[PDB]
Design a protein around this nucleic acid. Structure first.
Lengths: 404, 376, 124, 50, 224
RNA sequence: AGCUUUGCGCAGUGGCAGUAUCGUAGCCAAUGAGGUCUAUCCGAGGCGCGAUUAUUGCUAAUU
């Protein structure tokens, strides 16, 4: 009877929104509000009713003209190294291996009272730039850890600061020397004599993770979280290529020492090797699971290494256009992957495992674990001389390593 | 050896930074002004940590003369002023001297009474000279601290624009100085901020309620003190919470206009008005109409227990019976006519005395039992 | 979207895991609600990790918690909702910051360690 | 005791960063030791890095 | 994206559901669809309920009271047992909760043990990996014992705890990480007297780098 | 394969207290309710209003 109808009414789900109740009542044609009918009585009535019922082309041409001779020269350098007796190459190989295994924590300096997100060696291997989350970038002398020229920095956390390739060697200190990226996307240029930014590159409305110059020193590569990476031309003072190829945010960008290629490693878990001369994705990295947080083109010119959250460091061969070896480096998220700047002497890896490891570039076997620190190793860099290793960390300190 | 030696360095640094502060004040009316504020607010901490050391030294030195004054006067500045005023001669008419400004009248009579029976020997002339030197140094440090607080209060519209709106610049200056910095203030819970500047004032034969305990600068702020005393605790708590929010906003240099501060002050004023809101109209409950109809009431365990409790007991049944012609003797002076009746008297008919019914035993309320458990 | 000031923001899966762990901690009497109690736990070093919301307005009222976490070496994470975080804590009122305390011998220790490892590798 | 004494020498030598590195290496080689932690904390406190 | 409920919310829900059920039962009784409830009687309640009837027929009243109590107990047992997980259904729930979704990714841990001669330890590793769906391989050498274990994060954590505390020469975690896809099957415990064919077997699955790391770490430990 | 922890239901048995149990399209509340003690410490509901045999039903009597 009607008791069963009342039982049915209880089981009927009716929206608790007054506007939705009024809309449902009007849809059925019944009066929206009776006299003295509040929202609760309206809901009860609804329940009962329901129960009843051209610069790009010029830049590309310049990059090609700059890169082709360098690629050729690298080719004859490799041919000459092949002509070198195998005994000499082997001997210098174990000399390098013995030198690496003797590395010790040379120094330990508090960069700032906040975690240090990046560290970069100057081209003359005498100055070190550290990027901090406090919004301050600092320049440190390499042989002795002491602050020499602080920077006012950004307002948010600073992602990465990279020296100009010709800085401290050829161009004047008052010119552009450094490019720093922040957590708000702002990119600011710096000079070795002015604490305030020389210039403020704009256009990145979203956070940019890494910023690095082209080896020619004329183009600056920025990677945003807009699934995009941008190339900024210093001479033109305007971004050139806002390439959109990553499915997710783009974290790291690595340039080719020849200058012909550029590699972008993003949160898409896949990497892409764009062609700076033609603007087409020549080779598409695949195999990494989870976001890739590191990438660096080897000075050899045909090897690429990438570090991701898989606790792995995959080495990619450009000649075969495929991965060659997967290095299971560290037991936590890998961030910094970098080869020896001069040649393929070794591979340096850093991760959130508060440790760094060294691997032979050809053999991909461990040599020395740079154990130390007490916080996650955010970034690392090797000096152009090759015997200097700097590893910033979450421990608010950066450390130097030289053979002893 | 150490405190005296460090006193000169502290004074020199304070003088240099106070000259810097005066230069900044003149310039306002690349050495930015924020660093000056940071230096002054660190100077406040340094001055406090030197003044407490000086107060401890004076307390140790003066304890030979009048050892009991430390307990009577817990405040450091009041202790220093009192030992300066009294000096070696306790009974030197200083009681009706400036002590009335230093201390409350009740504690003045307390300290005079205690000094009447000091049982403490006089101090040597070198001990004297050292005591007045320490007192003068402490007073100079207090004056420097007052100058620094004045300068910081003059610049509270920039360092903490939001927190200035709520409690004003003076209370802002006091809480920022006692907290050790705006950053230190932000990294602090609202409960601790409410107790900033609180003093463990001695109660001289009074309840702890009379001498307001756990009350700090915020409790004595203008907005909190404007409420009736029965609502000032809630006012202090709410204002302290909103001031903590503003300080956290201010330490990141956000809402420099004061929009957060204005919103928080408006919320505080609305809550204060709600507390001051007049009570609503409440209907008068009429007397229930007398009723003679039969009413059916359930039985069971509850009814059985109530019947057992309220029911007549043999001890009470026997006390209601009074013998006829057996003129008993008065057993209670304070109330005549009172009698035990047949209890323990001849003619009761019972050889053995009736036992006490345990169902009539006294028991306390459930809420009262909860309060007693909480008190434990 | 969300305030960029809350950079260590958890995704949906980690948000669900964090809310489940917060509810379990509340059931085990191992949780502290509110930014003030989170600050108190951080100052006393009895906090496993701090979960705070990204909808706090203004967000600067809890941005001091990451600094205290860095000082005390305690993981911290940002959740996208202050209403779901409050519900996870067992309180109908929104909660913008909750702290999971340290209790020796607690059966939640393994889950707490797993969540700490997940959070500490997500900030960047 | 060899570790902390060498670190104290490095502090006295004037190269405090080398003392920091030595203490960090000592803590790495001897995990969870209050003795090395105490000296490491005192090193920053005595250097003004409160 | 589920929303949790406060204890007051739970109390309100339970109270209002019980009140609705009680009102429905009372309406059914009053309407005549349900007989009125007989008083609940126990042994201590026997006289208070039927003293007049208990005097005339003590054993009959006792039998009636015990019959009512046994009816209540039987109803309770029938409710409990009716709603009981079948023995096979208990396994199905257990066999599913331990089956993590490796579609997103597989977690791989590599272990190196100095000695693995004990057959009981071999059986422990094999059974624990099989129950936890931890597909992998065990390669036995003179010193190197590569234990590649792949599966779900919960199983990986349990198995790591297994050899770290439950099972004892020492056990060292070489590398714990994730990969896109699995590369080994069930436990096989391959015997590898020499390094060359062990490396070849690891290359068959495409995971020779685990063997390389284990061998290099063992060599470094031996030199140390 | 067993064992066991927490929370939520559903029942069973047992104990205790009826000066208390509920209701909240009323208000306030972890952006802190409320603080006699321990206050640079405590951390959750409070208040107002309403219902009542200090939870509410049947059953049996007299009526």
């Amino acid at each position: 009877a009607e008791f069963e109808r009342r039982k049915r009414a209880r089981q009927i789900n009716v929206s608790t929104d007054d506007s939705e109740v009024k809309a449902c009542l009007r849809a059925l044609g019944e009066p929206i509000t009776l006299f003295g009918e509040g929202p609760a009585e309206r809901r009860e009535r609804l329940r009962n009713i329901l129960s009843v019922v051209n610069s790009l082309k010029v830049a590309r041409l310049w990059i090609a003209n700059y890169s082709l001779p360098r690629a050729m020269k690298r080719l004859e350098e490799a041919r000459l190294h092949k002509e070198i007796p195998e005994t000499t190459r082997t001997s210098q190989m174990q000399e390098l291996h013995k030198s690496l295994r003797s590395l010790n924590n040379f120094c330990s300096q508090i960069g700032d009272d906040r975690p240090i997100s990046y560290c970069h060696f100057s081209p003359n291997s005498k100055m070190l730039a550290t990027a901090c989350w406090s919004g301050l970038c600092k320049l440190w002398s390499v042989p002795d850890c002491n602050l020499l020229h602080t920077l006012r920095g950004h307002n948010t956390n600073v992602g990465a600061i990279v020296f100009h390739p010709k800085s401290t060697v050829s161009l004047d200190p008052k010119d552009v020397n450094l490019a720093s990226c922040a957590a708000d996307g702002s990119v600011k240029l710096w000079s070795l004599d002015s604490d305030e930014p020389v210039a403020d590159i704009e256009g990145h409305t979203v956070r940019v993770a890494r910023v690095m110059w082209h080896p020619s020193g004329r183009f600056l590569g920025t990677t945003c979280y807009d699934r995009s990476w941008r190339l900024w031309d210093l001479e033109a003072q305007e971004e050139i290529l806002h390439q959109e190829g990553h499915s997710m945010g783009v974290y790291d960008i690595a340039f080719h020492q020849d200058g012909s290629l550029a590699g972008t490693g993003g949160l898409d878990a896949f990497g892409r090797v764009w062609d700076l001369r033609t603007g087409r994705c020549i080779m598409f990295l695949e195999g990494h699971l989870k976001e890739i947080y590191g990438i660096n083109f080897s000075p050899n010119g045909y090897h690429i290494a990438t570090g991701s959250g898989d606790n792995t460091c995959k080495v990619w061969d450009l000649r075969q256009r495929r991965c060659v070896y997967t290095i299971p480096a560290h037991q936590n998220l890998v961030t910094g992957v970098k080869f020896e700047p001069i040649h393929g002497n070794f591979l340096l890896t850093g991760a959130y495992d508060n440790t760094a490891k060294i691997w032979t570039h050809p053999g991909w076997s461990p040599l020395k674990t740079l154990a130390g620190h007490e916080g996650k190793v955010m970034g690392l860099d090797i000096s152009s001389d090759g015997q200097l290793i700097a590893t910033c960390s979450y421990d608010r300190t950066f450390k130097l390593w030289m053979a002893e | 050896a150490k405190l005296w030696d460090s006193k000169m360095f502290a004074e020199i640094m304070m003088k240099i930074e106070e000259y810097i502060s005066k230069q900044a004040k003149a310039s306002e009316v690349a050495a930015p002004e924020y660093r000056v504020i940071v230096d002054a607010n660190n100077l406040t901490v340094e001055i406090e940590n030197e003044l407490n050391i000086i107060h401890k030294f004076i307390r140790d030195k003066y304890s030979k003369r009048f050892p009991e004054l430390e307990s009577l006067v817990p405040n450091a500045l009041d202790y220093i002023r009192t030992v300066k005023e009294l000096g070696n001669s306790l009974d030197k008419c200083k009681n009706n001297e400036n002590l009335q400004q230093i201390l409350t009248n009740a504690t003045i009579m307390v300290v005079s009474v205690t000094a009447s029976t000091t049982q403490g020997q006089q101090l040597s002339e070198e001990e004297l000279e050292r005591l007045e030197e320490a007192c003068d140094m402490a007073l100079e440090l207090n004056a420097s601290k007052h100058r620094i607080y004045e300068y910081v209060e003059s610049r509270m519209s920039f360092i903490a624009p939001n927190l200035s709106i709520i409690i004003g610049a003076s209370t802002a200056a006091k809480i920022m100085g006692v907290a050790g910095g705006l950053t230190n203030l932000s990294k602090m819970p609202a409960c601790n901020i409410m107790l900033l500047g609180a003093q463990r004032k001695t109660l001289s034969g009074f309840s702890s309620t009379s001498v307001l305990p756990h009350t700090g600068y915020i409790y004595h702020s203008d907005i909190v003190q404007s409420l009736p005393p029965d609502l000032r605790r809630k006012a202090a708590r709410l204002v302290a919470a909103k001031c903590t929010l503003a300080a956290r906003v201010d330490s990141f240099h956000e809402s420099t206009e004061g929009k957060v501060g204005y919103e928080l002050k408006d919320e505080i004023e609305r809550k204060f008005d709600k507390w001051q809101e007049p009570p609503p109209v409440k209907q008068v409950k009429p007397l229930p109409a007398p009723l003679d109809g039969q009413r059916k009431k359930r039985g069971g365990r509850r009814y059985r227990k109530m019947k057992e409790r309220l029911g007549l007991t043999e001890i009470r049944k026997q006390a209601n019976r009074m013998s006829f012609g057996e003129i008993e003797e008065d057993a209670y002076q304070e109330d005549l006519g009172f009698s035990l009746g047949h209890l323990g008297k001849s003619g009761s008919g019972r050889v053995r005395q009736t036992q006490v019914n345990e169902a009539t035993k006294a028991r306390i309320s459930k809420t009262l039992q909860r309060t007693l458990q909480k008190q434990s | 979207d969300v305030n960029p000031k809350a950079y260590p923001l958890a995704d949906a899966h980690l948000t669900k895991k964090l809310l489940d762990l917060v509810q379990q901690s509340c059931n085990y009497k191992q949780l502290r609600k509110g930014a003030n109690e989170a600050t108190k736990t951080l100052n006393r070093g009895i906090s496993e990790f701090i979960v705070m919301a990204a909808d706090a307005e203004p967000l600067e009222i809890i941005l001091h918690l990451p600094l205290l976490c860095e000082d005390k070496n305690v993981p911290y994470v940002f959740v996208r909702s202050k209403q779901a975080l409050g519900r996870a804590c067992g309180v109908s009122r929104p909660v913008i910051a909750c702290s999971v305390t340290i209790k020796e011998g607690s059966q939640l220790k393994q889950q707490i360690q797993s969540i700490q490892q997940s959070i500490e590798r997500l900030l960047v | 005791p060899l570790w902390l004494l060498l670190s104290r020498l490095e502090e006295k030598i004037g190269q405090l960063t080398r003392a920091r590195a030595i203490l960090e290496k000592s803590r790495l080689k001897n995990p969870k030791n209050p003795g090395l932690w105490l000296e490491s904390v005192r090193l920053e406190y005595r250097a003004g890095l409160k | 994206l589920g929303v949790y409920l406060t204890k007051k919310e739970q109390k309100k829900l339970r109270r209002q559901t019980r009140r609705e059920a009680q009102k429905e039962l009372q309406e059914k009784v009053r309407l005549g669809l349900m007989p009125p409830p007989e008083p609940k009687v126990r042994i201590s309640n026997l006289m208070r309920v039927l003293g007049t009837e208990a005097v005339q027929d003590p054993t009959k009243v006792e039998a009636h009271v015990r019959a009512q109590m046994a009816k209540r107990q039987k109803a309770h047992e029938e409710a409990n047992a009716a709603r009981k997980l079948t023995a096979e259904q208990r396994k199905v729930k257990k066999i599913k909760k331990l089956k993590e979704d490796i579609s997103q990714g597989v977690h791989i841990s590599v272990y190196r043990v100095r000695n693995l001669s004990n057959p009981a330890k071999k059986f422990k590793i094999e059974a624990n990996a099989g129950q936890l769906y931890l597909t992998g391989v065990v390669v036995l050498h003179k010193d190197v014992n590569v234990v590649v274990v792949e599966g779900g994060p919960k199983a990986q954590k349990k198995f790591k705890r297994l050899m770290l505390h439950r099972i004892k020469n020492k056990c060292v975690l070489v590398w714990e990480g994730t990969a896109k896809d699995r590369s080994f099957g069930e436990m096989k415990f391959k015997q590898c007297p020499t390094e060359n064919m062990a490396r070849e077997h690891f290359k068959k699955h495409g995971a020779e780098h685990y063997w390389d790391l284990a061998l290099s770490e063992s060599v470094l430990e031996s030199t140390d």
